[PDB]
């Protein structure tokens, strides 16, 4: 027996010595040293210090630079708002709880932080998906006559909200649940204990299929098409040096975007899959934190990839950061 169960929680440490306490009531210094809790706070501190300015700066330059306010940019703004839900719903809460060594806000607060942290990360994910769809549509022109405008952009944003709710909301009302996780200082979807009263198993399958596999398939198709279209245009236009460059830069971005998506979600997927296939084995607190590390850090690296590496945003950020010049 590798853990300790409780009404709203599961502590990945055995209570044979009787030292385990509820993650809502007392420090968890028996499942990790105090210093590792410090390191956890240090880490959240990093993600806040990098993730706040980068994502906020994104919203700010958009207010300052008329040119950024175009429909194809809406989903990138959305992305930055989502990253901010992660930073304030999740990262700050976790900075705070980790320094107490347990989830001091209790089961209801567990639901608040789990909801907003999950909402944020899911809006982000569906943003990356919608952005790929939009790009496919605009560049690959799979629909004759179609012109992408404001209204489609809004529908793209709303779609992500809805897909995110379809993921974060259920565990608030019967299907899966939010419980503290890994080191018990932050809360997420219970994807690792069979808890029939909430139907964890099927929810995990739904997550895997609808919120990982679909996303992954849509992104590969769209960007695969996009790279194909751009290779073809270039091959038919080798007299144009610019076009040859666009093809190289675009292929490079796609590799980067796709690898980044994998790094962010594959670990959670790989771990949820394993646990599902190897029922209730000894999964330690620090091991359950690895997929979380990968997913959470995306509130920094996504804006680097999708915002800072985008010529327009970058120029506008530079102009705004240098007080108005250059």
């Amino acid at each position: 027996m590798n853990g300790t169960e409780g009404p709203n929680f599961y502590v990945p440490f055995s209570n044979k010595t009787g030292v385990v306490r509820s993650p809502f009531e007392a420090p968890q210094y028996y499942l990790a040293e105090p210093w590792q809790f410090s390191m956890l706070a240090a880490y959240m501190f990093l993600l806040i210090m990098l993730g706040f300015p980068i994502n906020f700066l994104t919203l700010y330059v958009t207010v300052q630079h008329k040119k950024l306010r175009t429909p194809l940019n809406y989903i990138l703004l959305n992305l930055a708002v989502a990253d901010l839900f992660m930073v304030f719903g999740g990262f700050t809460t976790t900075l705070y709880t980790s320094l107490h060594g347990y989830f001091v806000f209790g089961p209801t607060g567990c639901n608040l932080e789990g909801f907003f942290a999950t909402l944020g990360g899911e809006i982000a994910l569906w943003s990356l998906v919608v952005l790929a769809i939009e790009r496919y549509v605009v560049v690959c022109k799979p629909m004759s006559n179609f012109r992408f405008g404001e209204n489609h952009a809004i529908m793209g944003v709303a779609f992500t909200w809805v897909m995110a709710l379809a993921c974060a909301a259920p565990p608030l009302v019967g299907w899966s649940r939010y419980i503290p996780e890994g080191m018990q200082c932050s809360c997420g979807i219970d994807y690792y204990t069979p808890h029939e009263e909430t139907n964890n198993e099927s929810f995990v399958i739904y997550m895997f299929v609808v919120h990982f596999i679909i996303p992954l398939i849509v992104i590969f198709f769209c960007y695969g098409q996009l790279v194909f279209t751009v290779k073809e245009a270039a091959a038919q236009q080798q007299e144009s040096a610019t076009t040859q460059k666009a093809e190289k830069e675009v292929t490079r971005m796609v590799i980067i975007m796709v690898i980044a998506f994998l790094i962010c979600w594959l670990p959670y997927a790989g771990v949820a899959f394993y646990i599902f296939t190897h029922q209730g084995s000894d999964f330690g607190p620090i091991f359950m934190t690895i997929p979380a590390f990968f997913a959470k850090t995306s509130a920094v690296y996504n804006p680097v990839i999708y915002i800072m590496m985008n010529k327009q945003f970058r120029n506008c950020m530079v102009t705004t950061l240098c007080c108005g010049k250059n």
Binding site: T70, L72, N73, L76, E134, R135, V138, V139, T229, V230, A233, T242, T243, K245, A246, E249, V250, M253, Y306, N310, K311, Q312, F313
Partner: peptide, 11 residues
């Protein structure tokens, strides 16, 4: 493609 690529932030 070029104008399209610029529009979507890829080039």
């Amino acid at each position: 493609i070029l104008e399209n690529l610029k529009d979507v932030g890829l080039f």
